[PDB]
Write a protein that binds this ligand. Structure first.
Ligand SMILES: c1cncc([C@H]2[C@@H]3C[C@H]4C[C@@H](C3)CN2C4)c1
Ligand SMILES: c1cncc([C@H]2[C@@H]3C[C@H]4C[C@@H](C3)CN2C4)c1
Lengths: 209, 212, 209, 209, 214
């Protein structure tokens, strides 16, 4: 019965939240998405096509008024897990991939009572990269931008929580050593559009182990 | 609390607009034809395979069209001038590469932008393998290949294709590609086939390239 | 208002047809499918596995009473488009593929007021084929049967409009040239089932350009 | 005649409606599945990974009281086709595959008025096999077992019509020729559990052509 | 006709049971207030391929998962003496156990069907092919090569899902006898680790395999 009670409280929360009266962000109702990368592995560097294959965890975080609740009204529940399909998620995309991203983890988000969401898909990505110099001490340098496909900086702003990519889980016996890995918010002016555009630029310098 | 009420207000206006529009288009017909504007942004020639004569491209395919049924007065909807929506929520054109050798791979979210004048813009990123003899790519002259894009089931009487320019946009071409672009054009072609009285329209993407 | 009139006539037509009171063909209500192939490219011939990859257009046509209408009753509309997934379509299958067929085009059918349906997918198909001889003047010959996977000749019959496969859209700079290509109706019996099954046999003779 | 075609069509729709308005087999309600293979091709024998790739047709038959009807009550209809998704199908699985099976045919089944079902998916299968000896006169030998993943012999009894694999469609210009192919029902008894477990062992001996 | 009725009878009893369990008023997954223990057991069937150009190895294994829920208990006496049943894994909550270092999406080789027993226990055993991060250097020597991959919930911390094994010993009794690689050693071990994202501990089972060319 006690177990039944906490389960009903959570079901009540989710029912309350998911039947509320979210169309995504707008210039009137903008959103900030925080991005951070945890680089696991540079799997392959193909010098015949200039593609490199990375494996990483991409941490996304955003906050929505419509996902807030007072834990006191819901049995002291302070967070819950739910399918990422149950909620709005941002359309963060690599801007220079050469193959569809392959998702390596379940698509499940953690929602917290302050309305914040954490969603961390693991991905394998092939992106445009010239690995010349990777067989040298200086190594090779490559970069890929991540951002919304269709929202401007007026509707979705981005930030990182740190400039430094998390290398604490980088595979110690990878074919490639990381010499440095940074992630930087960029502000772009494009001649085509009045709106500012924002991306996060992931830059990795690496060489053969 | 006032700030919260204002967000809900804007959110409610957008949901009312979307609800109004998606409860009101069966695709183009001879009586009601549609002009679709195409433009390519070429990002990369990834691979040129001389053993199979396939060449792989990455590009952004901009598609634009305008429907009366998607029009609205911003004054009636909280001054909203446009919105983002799933491409599955609206009709989209069946523009197809005519000489692909693999199903095209989509690299971007399939989300379109709709503006109050009824115009839609949809720009999927794609990787395409298509029929191309790369002979000469290892030379100053380079190699030349072409692929036509057009509707699968609509003739020129139902969908007219336009380009805004004959010049492919190369301002985002990957600087360290294995292949450099000598030229890239996109040309509207009107075709008359012996099989059928109705005219056909395609856009011919012609790319000249060589090893960097 | 005129445009809305045109559009309303089209929706009325599809509504009327879609709500009729077609379960597929039966022995009492058999169907004839016209099948035609147009070859675009022999992409690859693998002599290590005896698999060859072909790109082609497969033209399928059939006619249903239930899809007929009088254009006078419907604003003179003579035809319309529908997703192939929204109507019954014949389960035409290559008998000797070695990988799932890959679809290179939209799956959209054209329905005409006389009740005829035209569906023309572009496909890439890997099938069983020994390319020995392809580097000689006489080339190599291969064949693949196409037919309904589950309907016998008593429910689905097949016909061609011509025995000669159209080569005029064949890729002029393919690694392989076509020496001949024919398509022929065949009737076959298998131990599993008492009824005959119909196929169209595609026979292609080809060699290195 | 248009009325007659609608008549037979209505009869079929009525039948299907009646039938499609079963929790799987149980110890109290057991089911026999008959299996037979038609081996079409050994496509590939990979001595670098000890994987061999087979293309075959897997015939499955079983019968359910819930699918029976009197043809006299339904316009003399004696069978019909229906999507395999519309009915229960057995979970027959290869026990040593190394890749997900690739489906090469439409998933459509044939139901007969006696309640029997015939379902014959064409598949490409990679499975565990050491092809050592394949380039010799004696050839190589490989084996793979098929059976239910989750049902015991008290729920699903497996049977074959014949211990001979059907070779009547084996690709005559395969890279590999068949020396013999058998499909043998095996019953195993285990000390752990009161119920017996059943499989069909597919054994193929083959060599380079 | 009596037998036909009896069959219908047992079928109705099973459908009644399933309808009753799947409409209970609903298991929302584990929480800090209602935590769950998941037992894992690995059966290694084959090392298919070792790729020294990319340091990726491909395994085939069966991943046995077991857990128990109150909401899935019934009295067999109330349901025709039914003591267990099979059901699609989509009909029930299942744990999001994930390899932490795969390099390609895991491929499932077996039907997604679970077995539920009257005491509320569940057994789900998917067969999988996995590519993961692994340096095969040494595989062609007597000492062979050693690699490891962690398995754990992707989104549930140790406060919601505890993972356990029953044994250190990876089951090798169905390992392919003519594999390109023979297994020198295989162990499965529970671990607790912290990550940058969160303050909570996450639990994994570490699968360690020593292998060499046969
Ligand atoms: C009946 C039901 N499903 C499939 C079939 C198959 C069988 C194998 C092959 C030939 C014939 C028999 C029709 N078709 C293709 C028949
Ligand atoms: C919380 C929410 N989403 C994802 C996670 C990830 C994080 C990376 C990795 C380890 C740990 C932390 C759990 N899991 C896999 C935690």
């Amino acid at each position: 019965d006690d177990k039944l009670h906490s389960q009903a409280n959570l079901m009540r929360l989710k029912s309350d939240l998911f039947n509320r009266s979210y169309p995504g962000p707008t210039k009137d109702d903008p959103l900030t998405v925080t991005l951070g990368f945890t680089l696991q592995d540079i799997v392959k560097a193909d010098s015949s096509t200039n593609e490199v294959d990375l494996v990483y965890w991409e941490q996304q975080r955003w906050k929505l008024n419509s996902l807030m609740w007072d834990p006191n009204e819901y049995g002291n529940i302070t967070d819950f897990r739910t399918s990422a399909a149950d909620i709005w998620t941002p359309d963060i995309t690599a801007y220079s991939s050469t193959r569809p991203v392959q998702v390596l983890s379940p698509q499940i988000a953690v929602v917290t009572h302050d309305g914040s969401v954490m969603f961390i898909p693991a991905q394998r990505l092939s992106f445009m990269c010239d690995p010349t110099g990777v067989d040298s001490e200086e190594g090779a340098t490559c970069a890929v931008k991540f951002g919304s496909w269709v929202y401007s900086g007026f509707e979705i702003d981005l930030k990182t929580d740190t400039d430094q990519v998390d290398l604490s889980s980088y595979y110690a016996s990878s074919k490639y050593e990381i010499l440095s890995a940074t992630q930087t918010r960029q502000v772009q002016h494009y001649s085509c559009c009045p709106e500012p555009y924002i991306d996060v630029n992931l830059v990795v310098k690496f060489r053969e182990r």
